[PDB]
Amino acid sequence: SLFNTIAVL
Amino acid sequence: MIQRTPKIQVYSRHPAENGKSNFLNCYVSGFHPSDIEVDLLKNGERIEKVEHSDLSFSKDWSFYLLYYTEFTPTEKDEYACRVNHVTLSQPKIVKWDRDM
């Protein structure tokens, strides 16, 4: 199950 | 940038037994970048029904892939892995050896 709201670099 | 040369292994999934079906594996690892051409050969000719694993990588960021095909070993049929990569001036052919 993946992580949800992923931050941009 | 970084360029790492693939390590190559040619092997069967099971101990090779003439007339019994198996899988021929070629595992390439430790390479960067990920562009690579890997062929399995039968008596020096490209086998057409060859699959590979989904691209993944190690702790040190270098890439590894498993290429594979179904086969029935015989006494006289020669098998090999042919690999080309930007770190290689010509493709590298590695022969299959059942005790290796």
Binding site: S1, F3, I6, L9 | I2, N25, Y27, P33, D54, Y68
Partner: protein
């Protein structure tokens, strides 16, 4: 007993060839269970283990949605990073991403990871506390300044501590036959004659799970580290792994050498000798 779950993302930019490549793969210990390939016709998170096929439509819809989301973030990073080291719009470049968590025999939380690399050189990673960052060079000091403000770590932290361990724990008890197994290596030894005076002894370990193993040769009890040919552990293709170690020995002296084998599924580490 200890376990772990990891996710790997790779992006090779395709300039003058269209959309960048994107491969997403997922693992429990050394068994892969899911993948997403950009050039595959599905455009959906696919099952790669037979114990994950048990999940319903809401799970696949969920993992599909989130995976497309990871993909698009990577699509942006490639240019952001291209806009730091002075890279041309011409050449190709790679971004790599690992994140996941580890547990013990009790299945309770052990540690979490989030690493990031650009072009095979390390770039930025969560420190072992999950509250701070290691920046590999001057360029990722700007990434660090940026993420530190927007509490990016705290989101990554809560997943890695809670939601990560809970899903790992459902998977282990769904793949009980597969994941909660340890297969002892089937070990044996071959003898090949190089010449009339030298001979090769290869020590074999086959059909084991998971991949972790130590093979060593000794002569009279003294380690032969300098003189051992050792191969990288390799997939068999059926969920198990293979490995070997070899020494070149004089004929008659074969009884002086012993092969030593340590695995998670051997109660006593084995010592092998040639007859």
């Amino acid at each position: 007993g200890s376990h772990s779950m990891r996710y790997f993302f790779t992006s090779v930019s395709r300039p003058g060839r269209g959309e960048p490549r994107f491969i997403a793969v997922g693992y429990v210990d050394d068994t892969q269970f899911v993948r997403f390939d950009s050039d595959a016709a599905s455009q959906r998170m696919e099952p790669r283990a037979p114990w994950i096929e048990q999940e319903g439509p809401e799970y696949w819809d969920g993992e599909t949605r989130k995976v497309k989301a990871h993909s698009q973030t990577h699509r942006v990073d490639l240019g952001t990073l291209r806009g730091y080291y002075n890279q041309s719009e011409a050449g190709s470049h790679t971004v790599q991403r690992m994140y996941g968590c580890d547990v013990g025999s009790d299945w309770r939380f052990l540690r979490g990871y989030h690493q990031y690399a650009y072009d095979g050189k390390d770039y930025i990673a969560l420190k072992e506390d999950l509250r701070s960052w290691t920046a590999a060079d001057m360029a990722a000091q700007t990434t660090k300044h940026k993420w530190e403000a927007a509490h990016v770590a705290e989101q990554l932290r809560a997943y890695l501590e809670g939601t990560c361990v809970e899903w790992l724990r459902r998977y282990l008890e769904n793949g009980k036959e597969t994941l909660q197994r340890t297969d002892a290596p089937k070990t044996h030894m071959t003898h090949h004659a190089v010449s009339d005076h030298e001979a090769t002894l290869r020590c074999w370990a086959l059909s084991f799970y998971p991949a972790e193993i130590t093979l060593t040769w000794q002569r009279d009890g003294e380690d032969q580290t300098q003189d051992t040919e050792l191969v990288e552990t390799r997939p068999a293709g059926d969920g198990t792994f293979q490995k070997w170690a070899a020494v070149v020995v004089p004929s008659g002296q074969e009884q002086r050498y012993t092969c030593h084998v340590q695995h998670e599924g051997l109660p006593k580490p084995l010592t092998l000798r040639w007859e």
